[PDB]
Design an enzyme around this catalytic site. Sequence first.
Site, PDB file in Angstrom:
ATOM      1  N   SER A 205      14.833 -11.596  -7.906  1.00  0.00           N
ATOM      2  CA  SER A 205      16.064 -11.184  -8.568  1.00  0.00           C
ATOM      3  C   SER A 205      16.680  -9.971  -7.879  1.00  0.00           C
ATOM      4  CB  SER A 205      15.795 -10.867 -10.042  1.00  0.00           C
ATOM      5  OG  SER A 205      15.030 -11.889 -10.656  1.00  0.00           O
TER       6      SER A 205
ATOM      7  N   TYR B 255      11.986  -8.312 -16.517  1.00  0.00           N
ATOM      8  CA  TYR B 255      12.198  -8.266 -15.075  1.00  0.00           C
ATOM      9  C   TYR B 255      10.934  -7.827 -14.340  1.00  0.00           C
ATOM     10  CZ  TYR B 255      13.481  -6.036 -10.649  1.00  0.00           C
ATOM     11  OH  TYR B 255      13.520  -5.623  -9.339  1.00  0.00           O
TER      12      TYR B 255
END
Lengths: 187, 189
Positions: free
Chosen positions: B127, B134
């Site tokens: 990402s 995340y």
Amino acid sequence: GAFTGKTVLILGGSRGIGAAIVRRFVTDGANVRFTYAGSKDAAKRLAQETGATAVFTDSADRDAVIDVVRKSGALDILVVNAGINADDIDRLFKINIHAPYHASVEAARQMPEGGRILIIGSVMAAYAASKSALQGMARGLARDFGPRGITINVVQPGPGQPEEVAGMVAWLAGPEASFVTGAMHTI
Amino acid sequence: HMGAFTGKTVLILGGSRGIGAAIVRRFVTDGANVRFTYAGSKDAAKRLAQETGATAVFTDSADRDAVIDVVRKSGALDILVVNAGALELNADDIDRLFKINIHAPYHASVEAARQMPEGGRILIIGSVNGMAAYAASKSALQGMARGLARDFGPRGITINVVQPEEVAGMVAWLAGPEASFVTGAMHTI
């Protein structure tokens, strides 16, 4: 006891490491509730032995996990015990990664400062990904809920053992580990 | 024209926009037969496909079966590229995040390994930079790359993670001859 008056929720606490953690917190005078899925008889006997409250909950079912945490009010300590084909891998991810994330986030927004979130790792290569994910998640959660005075720790057991893991969990939940967070502890 | 990857088939999961589109352009430039999957705009995917001369096919990376199916349909592919990637996120979107960033790279890499020849290259794109979801996904990919490399090693298949044109260049290099021994590592750009 060391945790007298404290409210504890243990996801997946009917067997093995989970059961040892239930016994440990009950012995230390805490008010304990734990969840189970397939092992109804194991949970029944544990409830009879300890006096802890057992509630049925599918750890793979996300909404069930969120619901049982939400219905526990302002808990002091949350413990998420992972426990033990393309569907098998996805099941593994949901228990090792999804369930601890959802439970922790839900719990953290209900916890008072000093709250403790504890995640027990499960015991091919999906395992390496799962373990790594939990370590990353611990760091991320600690940053997120640190300002709230909440600590997040992962205990990763090796491939007896339950009693030793429970001891580590109890220590991490105590006053001596107030400044230990965002960590994965291998035992 | 011909290039570094002439005669090679490349499948790029999520190559319709951003880094994905850059990787599509780069491999086409290097003479590869490129196929990529898209999740959003059909117009943008069709535009990129016609602009580059690549194949475009719809696939929701969150759907495990769709991911496995589109990899299976690719046959004996040489290079797999898996491109992974608000105020408040609901539980479903969180699960979608995990499926895109963790589930899809695992299943796609495993399925592609069953189809690849010796020297096959698997590349996962991280990402672009609540942090918890995340952080977990990024760490998962690193642990996944190491674990799969041990399983793919004796097959002659390498697997690497590129964590963010600079990305596409690193991708093409890891897919090249020189990086035939490089596997199971996460590379930050």
